[PDB]
From a paper:
It catalyzes the stoichiometric symport of galactopyranoside with Na+, H+, or Li+. In all solved x-ray crystal structures, [name] is in an outward-facing conformation; the observed physical barrier of the sugar translocation, named the inner barrier, prevents the substrate from moving into the cytoplasm directly.
From a total number of 296,925 selected particles, structures of [name], [name], and NabFab were determined to a golden standard Fourier shell correlation (GSFSC) resolution of 3.29 Å at 0.143. CDR-1 (Arg30, Asp31, Asn32, and Ala33) and CDR-2 (Tyr52, Asp53, Leu54, Tyr56, Thr57, and Ala58) form interactions with two cytoplasmic regions of [name], the tip between helices IV and V, that is, loop (Pro132, Thr133, Asp137, Lys138, and Arg141) and the beginning region of the middle loop (Tyr205, Ser206, and Ser207). Most regions of the middle loop, the C-terminal helix bundle, and the C-terminal tail helix must be displaced to permit the binding, and some of those regions are completely disordered in this inward-facing structure. Between helices II and IV, one Na+ cation was modeled, liganded by four side -chains, Asp55, Asn58, Asp59 (helix II), and Thr121 (helix IV), at distances of between 2.1 and 2.8 Å. In the inward-facing state, the inner barrier is broken, which exposes the binding site to the cytoplasm and also results in the interruption of the sugar-binding pocket. The C-terminal binding residues moved away due to the displacement of the backbone of helices X/XI, and the sugar-binding residues become loosely organized, resulting in a low sugar-binding affinity. The resulting structure, a high-energy inward-facing, low sugar-affinity state of [name] with a bound Na+, represents the intracellular sugar-releasing/rebinding state in the stepped-binding model for the mechanism of coupled transport (Guan, 2018; Guan and Hariharan, 2021).
Author numbering:
A (entry chain H): 1 to 52, 52A, 53 to 82, 82A, 82B, 82C, 83 to 100, 100A, ...
B (entry chain A): 2 to 210, 219 to 355, 362 to 432
C (entry chain B): 2 to 123
D (entry chain L): 4 to 213
Write the structure that this text describes.
Amino acid sequence: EVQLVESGGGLVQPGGSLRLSCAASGFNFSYYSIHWVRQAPGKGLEWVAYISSSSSYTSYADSVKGRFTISADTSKNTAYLQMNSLRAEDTAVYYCARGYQYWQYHASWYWNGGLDYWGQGTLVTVSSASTKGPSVFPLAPSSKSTSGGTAALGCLVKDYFPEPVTVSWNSGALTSGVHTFPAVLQSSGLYSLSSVVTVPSSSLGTQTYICNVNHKPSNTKVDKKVEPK
Amino acid sequence: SISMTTKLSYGFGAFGKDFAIGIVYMYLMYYYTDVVGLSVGLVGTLFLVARIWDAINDPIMGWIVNATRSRWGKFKPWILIGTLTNSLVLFLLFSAHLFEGTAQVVFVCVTYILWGMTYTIMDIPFWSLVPTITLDKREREQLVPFPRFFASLAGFVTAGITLPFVSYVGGADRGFGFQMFTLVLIAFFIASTIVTLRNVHEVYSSDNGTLKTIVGLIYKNDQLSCLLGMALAYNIASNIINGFAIYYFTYVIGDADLFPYYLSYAGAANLLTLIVFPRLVKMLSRRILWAGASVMPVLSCAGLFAMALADIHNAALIVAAGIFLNIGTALFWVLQVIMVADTVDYIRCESIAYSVQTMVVKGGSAFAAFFIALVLGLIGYTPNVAQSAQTLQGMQFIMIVLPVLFFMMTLVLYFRY
Amino acid sequence: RQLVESGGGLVQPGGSLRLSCAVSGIIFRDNAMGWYRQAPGKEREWVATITDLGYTAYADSVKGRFTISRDNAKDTVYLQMNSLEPEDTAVYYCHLPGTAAGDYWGKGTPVTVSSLEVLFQG
Amino acid sequence: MTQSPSSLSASVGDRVTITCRASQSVSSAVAWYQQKPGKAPKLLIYSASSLYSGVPSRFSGSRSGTDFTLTISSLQPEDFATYYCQQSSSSLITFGQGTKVEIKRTVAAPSVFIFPPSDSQLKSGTASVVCLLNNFYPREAKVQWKVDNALQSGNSQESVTEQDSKDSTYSLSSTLTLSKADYEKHKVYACEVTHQGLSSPVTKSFNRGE
Ligand code: NA
């Protein structure tokens, strides 16, 4: 039954402060400690800070010391983490986990309790760009600069701020070999994405392909047709 | 913590025990003298021996209860056996007036000894329960007053209720009602035992647990030497007063039944003093409390004897004196507890000290019974059941005013320190 | 007052250990002292208790294996443990029941029993 | 604190050992966590050789001299994930690098393709060319852009999909971006791929004209 729940995620521009909260229900709150851990977009886990009910017990990681402040409420089982003066590399997913009340005390060459219960975690993004419209460009199937047996088609979605984009081919029916590579952050601060598909040379010249892109934050559709030329 | 159910059960058990024992401790000698028709010296010797033996046989049952180990535990089976055995012996005890001849005495002796043994069997585990059953620390100071309240209540109820029942069911046969009263006592006893057995459970068990050492300990603790001496005198005085009262209020004073007023109703003052005791102790110093404990009975007896001359036996006199005596008894009884721990602080040497108080109590009771028997036999013929021959009133007066000397001795011994 | 617990260590299955819960600041003749054990992903559970008289009560899981003793001269409570098993690996705390205003738990000591982890680097 | 195997390959019913140096000059027990993508890590073994409740017994721990180890006797399809150590030295908690556990399969060579800018996006003023590599199992595929026999560096973005679910292959796309002005200052562009399954590097080229 023991669980923890995260809240407070959103978009915060550089400098802008933010507050995250972790709440738990199922155990006595004074027998344990709460740890805040970070997972970068594509890297390994990193420990940020921890607090035990006794406010005299707190600790922060070196790379975050002096900028994040952690607290908790004895009455209501809540643990707040307020972070200000944010930076560009503090985009990540944050988890809260439960541990032992005195883990510094119980640390020897044979005992290591570990962290057992983990929260789902919330996404924090830092940037200075507003919602934009994805722009789609076709990829020309080269006349005879491709594999004889295999032909390639694709659409390129260049610039758009918000994280999610949806891509489909021929009304979302065809799925044979379609690949949608993960988005990449450009220097301009906008994500670029590419979607590709493969079909035999027999299909070309009679089959019709259209790349349909859906964007949630702003109601936008492109449905860009693909033709060889 | 201690629940209310356990406290109620442990009060009901004590109620049953004292309700069984009171009638035997008040009306037995009178029963033999004025109903059966026994001699006086025979009664004195019988009581002396059959009470000294019961005083000295206590430790053995401790070993037996330690040794017993079976399905039901080590206390419940002994309690259950003792209840029924003692009830049957008690019922048989009040039917000695159906025999005649040499066998009459033999039956008396056998039944009395059986009663003593069976009561010891029934009693030891019941009080051995508390230190094991549900007691960690300071949870006994809350449980202890509950059993003693009912223990005090039982004697008052019996003293106030006995005579009318026999009188209603008696008439030309004054033991036939005693037997029925015994039946009522047995019914209450069995019900109380059943209730306590059904509503008491065992937790915090334990395992694995000389005369020269005893004498060494007695000699070493001079304060302990004064403690037992102080206790013995008070026990003897109280036993004299509680036992001889019926004779006094039947012979010396007009037999208009002022005995129930003297004892049963002052029992209420006893209960109030007991229930309000902590505030009274907090209000006053301990030394003055002890002095009042040793003083009040002397005032009661002084009022009794002094107004016994040139009066018509004032009702206010009797009830007031009874109230004073009951207040003194309750206060001294409660004060006894605190001194033992302080004295013993300076085998186990504490479990041993626990039993010395009971030893002294029983010895004093036996000595008082023997003293009454001998003195009563000396002067005159009580078994007559007839008008009090003159020149015996002096004997009865000295008998009932002797306790004041024991009270004086106790006061002097305490005042020494 | 304060409760400080000692002992603890690594022992292979079937070993024995003794834990001493030194006490101070309270007259040692006092409320029963008990033991609790907590393991990762689990809550505190009761082990044994000994009263001021010397009567002892034990939890079912440890019955017949663990023993609890009270010493007034040293002002200490000792828990002897035998036939320890991997399920018995935990942090052991020294509870002081009674005085509901303050239970005054102890920090605890960690004891672990495992299949012969390479022993100390002496 | 370094996990010696950065990535691993195995199959069903194999024995796999994962090492953790923890060469921090300090001795402390280690706890092993398993993380799957898009989920939160789970605790497996807290004290070296002490299985956390409700974990199958096929996992095991150990502690060699100046080293820690985690062993899996039989690999079920559920064991493909990343595994982290932990060591709470002083008053800090430090994790490990992680060792992705992949699948072993027969080697395959990539298929290379190149796309030139379409008849659009030049009005915008930016050109973007893409080189596509498809269906190659081994992950060590390298790509280099060649423009007029000149190597262009620092202006390429590479995106690689996760291992497939049907055949356990990959697909890697490299994109090069340029301004319109610089786009038409050269004639021939190309991308060349080098892989461990290639006898000689492969290349695809196109001229700026049609
Ligand atoms: Na006895």
